[model samples]
Target chain A: MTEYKLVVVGACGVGKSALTIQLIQNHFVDIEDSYRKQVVIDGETSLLDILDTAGQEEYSAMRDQYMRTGEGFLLVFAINNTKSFEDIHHYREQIKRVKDSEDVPMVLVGNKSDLPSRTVDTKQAQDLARSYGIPFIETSAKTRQGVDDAFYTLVREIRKHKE
Target chain B: MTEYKLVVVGACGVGKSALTIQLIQNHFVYRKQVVIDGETSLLDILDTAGQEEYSAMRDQYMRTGEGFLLVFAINNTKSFEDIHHYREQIKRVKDSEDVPMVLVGNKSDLPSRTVDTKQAQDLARSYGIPFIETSAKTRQGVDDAFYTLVREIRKHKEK
Candidate 1:
């Protein structure tokens, strides 16, 4: 069985775990949810483990460790949160440092698409991805919008990298 | 004496803590600092207490706790690499619960700025007070960021 290891990288409470659960088990805690535990999914022929590095300052060491081990990186920021959008560059650097694997595929995930007030514009995200040569998608586990698409798209990219 | 209660908000690694400590104590951590239990600040301010709430369904209970905290938005994602912004967001949504806030842009000490300070300030106009830019490394304008929040929250027409 070919196992795909993907790490959901985002700030605390950006719904990384929720996105993982939504794709694997179709479950979510709540919009007000502040949970940041790891959800490891391993089916008969598949294994998907998502390590959400919550609160960067609090767990700087752990964040570094996870980034180094992550095979594929899912750079997630909230849709309406501009702060998250502006943060893409930092996440990229972290990935570059941790994972020695050259050309590790990255998918930019704009979470919280269910919100009407989106601070991060889609055009900006696409342009950035184009410059860095990565894929971009808007996702929301809360409403299950584009949740699977983001992960599947990433999986495809990872496959392409391996091939 | 009015001291602004500001919350450092952003994703997990956006330098929220460094900016907070930089402003309050004028210092920065070396990097990969260990998470000590009951991490308290000498400034009498409160951080979201780390990612403890991210442990499953505990988030729901934490969010019901408060309405707002100090609000600091940051820039130069590289400079603030060691910080997380979401702690402040969770603090606001959970404790402050939609309270008035002041937006802060940290890590201005970088030679070349990544995020447009004007863009962030303009975006923050409605959701928060006028955005102020600061640097935890040089401790520039850190005082302004915290004090402004106190003013905004105090002057806010709390119903």
Candidate 2:
């Protein structure tokens, strides 16, 4: 089995841990905490260490440190919060700075799709991701919408980097 | 004297603590953790740490806060971007449309400031809130900042 390191970065109450648990545990967990898991994709088993970095600004340095070892990243934000969407630019910039390259593997994720009062539009998020030359996706932890696809897309990007 | 509860909120590393400490130094009534304001009322500030890890406890603070000091760093634009969310969060948690707030720009002492004074002032104007610039280290504008917020809260209550 191979090993892949992934990191989730975003602002507080943005559903970073919710999305991680949805993908790893296949169910929603109420509390926001970090954990690891092992899963198999395409007949190949791999150990996935997904770090849910705390969203507090004091942990900004730790996010950068995690970025250094992460093979892939999920830059998450809640669709119902425009500020969380705006913060995606900072995370992208920080990852590029830490990795010292613009080609770092990442997926721009806008979670909380099930929320009725959405603040960030899909088109705007797509435009921002296009500007960064990254794939943009939306997910709903409540309904498990696009949760698996996000992890799958990221893992594919990480595998491509290795080859 | 009437006691008013105020909260200082912002992103981490945005000088929230420094501004709170400076305000306490300038007006705190001698080891009481209360600011002496014109012999009519006392201002008690809750210096809430601007970290996301402490976010779980913010609801309680917002529930009890009568006024707020929304702070941002002049050297970091990202911190400035977070103020709008903080403001909306406070309004939602407090469930009040007329929540008293003042926009504060800290770190005027730093020479490498990137966020322009006018930019912050413009944002404050857009939000219909008073704006003040302060250097916590030098104690510049610290007293005026808190005083302005207190005055605004009083005026809001009167109206």
Candidate 3:
């Protein structure tokens, strides 16, 4: 069984909790605070130790630690909140700074696709991810849409980089 | 046609920007720089969502603002609790207890609503502000929240 540590970084209230909980529990659970869980992907039974960043002021000090320990990253932001979407660059830069490399394994997630109106469209997020040379996906934790694909894709990228 | 300076204050991730864009029905306008470029009579929505240095910035925005929307996610109780801090900040900045404002419970479209409507309404009553639950995703109650704030501000302006 291969093990991979994954961290979910995003602005507050952007469905990081929703996605993480859905992945671990195989269904949506209302998680008010951030927590970690183990998940298996594929028949190989990989251990996914996840981190959900709260994106608070005090949490800034711990971000480097998360980046240091995380083998892969799921940089999530809400499509409805443009600032949240804009914040992905900051998180990405921080990860690069901590890891001291440009070749970090990661995925950009634009969550809350169930919303009718979105401030950050798919093209914008896709373009941004493309600029960073990373994969981009849109998800809706409320409806369980694109939830599994986001995580599995990240893990696959992490495995690809390891090989 | 009267102009209003409206500011949206809330904890990070309460859908402040979503509510603002929904109300204005326009593309993302970046803060004060665009105010002069856009129509002055239109409502200016400031997105002060997650600035680490909000203490200094809050005072500047609150004092010049005629109306405020204090938003919190219905699914996040801590976000609801943070409303008090924002209210107090506005009170201190505006130097008045009765600032024209509304309390918004966002993400009402989500299934997991940790913050009850009645609880938020009671808190709003205590503060003498209108409370409205909104979903930026579905656009439910979004207009009501903005309209209520603007109406209250207009009432205050008339006096």
Candidate 4:
């Protein structure tokens, strides 16, 4: 069994919980207020812990702590919002500080691919990915788009480099 | 004066800072260490915050606070490895929770452009503003992209 530690991140409301829920329970979250629980994945379940940190300005230290233990990092964005795309650099630097290596394997996730009037640019994102040498994927938690593939892809990358 | 707030977001190292520098400071942060100063924009700056609250967590509440927040969703499969596109998905609900919003794919500063295979799929993702990554060099589609947000806000105000 290949156990690994992976962290999922992005701007607020960018679908981190949905991605987690899909990865664990194999489904999307639709409820607005209710809490949708997240299950564990099937493959290679080790002493790995999945952390969903709060996306507020006050609670940043918690995320910092979680980063220290993460083996891999996933930076998510919404295809529906350009501001979210622009804020990722801070996240990348924080990850580098925590993981302290470019080889730690990071992924850029563009959520809400189903939206039409997105301020974020697809080519610009790809170009940025190329510059950093990181992979990018546009996903939709609503339609379960790229949900499974994203987690699986991250796992594969972390697995390849770690073991 | 059209006062507003714009939040920049995307995967790590996708040039969120670069975009910010170009848009706000009108320059590029080529070096890693230096802290770039923030320049004045045509729009009023609310809280210019970071996307990833930490390592791999998508922070949504901040994005929603803005009357007009833009999601910098990327356009590459490889960048999608760790960071799930789901973050953008989650933020859409927030956009509706508030007044208005704009979504930008961002990072069009490259020549490769290898992440447009899922356009129709993305359009179905949410009802937010749709725009491709724009380059600061040619100044292509940059104004139109931001205009969407202004338009959306106006539409909501009329409502």
Give the least accurate 10-residue stretch of model 3 chain A, judged by summed lDDT.
A29-38
Please give me the total number of clashing residue pairs in predicted model 4: 89
Which run of 10 residues does model 2 chain A get worst, by summed lDDT?
A54-63
lDDT score for residue A44 of model 2: 48
Show where candidate 3 strays beyond 4 Å. Answer: A29-38, A57-63, B1-159
Across residues B1-159, which tens digit of lDDT does each residue of candidate 2 receive? 677788888887888777777666653111123332222567777645443356667888888888888899899899999999999999999888888898988888889888998788778756766788888888888887777677667646644
Question: Per-residue lDDT of B73-114 in model 3, one digit per residue for the tens?
Answer: 999999999999888878887889778999999988899989
What C-alpha lDDT, on a 0 to 100 scale, does residue B8 get in candidate 2? Answer: 84
Candidate 3 per-residue lDDT, tens place, A98-153, comes to: 88889889999988887887899777887788788887777888777668768877
Q: Per-prediction DockQ, in order?
A: 0.01, 0.01, 0.01, 0.01
- The TM-scores, one per candidate, come to 0.45, 0.48, 0.48, 0.45
Q: Lowest lDDT 10-mer window, candidate 4 chain A?
A: A31-40
* C-alpha lDDT score of every prediction, in listed order: 0.59, 0.78, 0.77, 0.57
Provide all candidates' interface root-mean-square deviations. Answer: 21.7, 25.7, 20.7, 16.9
Q: Where is model 1 more than 4 Å wrong at Cα?
A: A31-44, A55-63, B1-159
Over 4 Å off in model 2, which ranges? A29-32, A54-64, B1-159
Report how far off residue A3 is in candidate 3 (Å): 1.7
